[PDB]
Swiss-Prot record, chain A:
Topological region Cytoplasmic: 7-13
Positions contributing to Ca(2+) binding: 35, 38, 40
Subunit structure: A hemichannel or connexon is composed of a hexamer of connexins. A functional gap junction is formed by the apposition of two hemichannels. Interacts with CNST. Forms heteromeric channels with GJB4.
Resulting phenotype, residue 43 to N: In KIDAD and HID syndrome
Disease involvement: Deafness, autosomal recessive, 1A: A form of non-syndromic sensorineural hearing loss. Sensorineural deafness results from damage to the neural receptors of the inner ear, the nerve pathways to the brain, or the area of the brain that receives sound information.
Residues annotated as transmembrane: 14-33
Organism superkingdom: Eukaryota
Compartments, record wording: Cell membrane; Cell junction, Gap junction
Protein name: Gap junction beta-2 protein
Part of the intact protein present: 8 to 58 of 226
Role: Structural component of gap junctions. Gap junctions are dodecameric channels that connect the cytoplasm of adjoining cells. They are formed by the docking of two hexameric hemichannels, one from each cell membrane. Small molecules and ions diffuse from one cell to a neighboring cell via the central pore.
From Swiss-Prot, chain B:
Full protein stretch here: 18 to 58 of 226
Effect the entry attributes to changing residue 17 to A: Loss of gap junction ion conductance, probably due to very low open probability of the channels. Can form functional channels with wild-type, but with strongly reduced channel conductance
Effect of substituting residue 27 to S: In DFNA3A; does not affect protein trafficking; affects the ability to form functional channels; dominant negative effect
Binding site for Ca(2+): 25, 28, 30
Transmembrane intervals: 4-23
Localization terms from the record: Cell membrane; Cell junction, Gap junction
Disease with which this protein is associated in UniProt: Deafness, autosomal recessive, 1A: A form of non-syndromic sensorineural hearing loss. Sensorineural deafness results from damage to the neural receptors of the inner ear, the nerve pathways to the brain, or the area of the brain that receives sound information.
Record's function text: Structural component of gap junctions. Gap junctions are dodecameric channels that connect the cytoplasm of adjoining cells. They are formed by the docking of two hexameric hemichannels, one from each cell membrane. Small molecules and ions diffuse from one cell to a neighboring cell via the central pore.
Entry protein name: Gap junction beta-2 protein
Species in which this protein is naturally found: Homo sapiens (Human)
Subunit structure: A hemichannel or connexon is composed of a hexamer of connexins. A functional gap junction is formed by the apposition of two hemichannels. Interacts with CNST. Forms heteromeric channels with GJB4.
Family: Belongs to the connexin family. Beta-type (group I) subfamily.
């Protein structure tokens, strides 16, 4: 519903900006990149004994 | 002389005395409790 409202009330090239914002920015952030940074600190290993 | 035998031999026995009955046990754990803040084998 939110996508439909923005898409119709937009210009021609502004629809190219909309599709590059959704299938590229939102999609890869949600389905691909989010689990890449899952263990960023859990698998951060330091060669030390200092607590 | 007086210093040639009495003082020289006594100081020599003193140095041996310190080394065996006192000093040897002080160094017995030199590497066992050498502690390094590291994880590197």
């Amino acid at each position: 519903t939110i996508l439909g409202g923005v898409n119709k009330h937009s210009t021609s090239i502004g629809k190219i900006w909309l599709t590059v914002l959704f299938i590229f920015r939102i999609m890869i952030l949600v389905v691909a990149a989010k689990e890449v940074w899952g263990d960023e600190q859990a698998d951060f290993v330091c060669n030390t004994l200092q607590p």
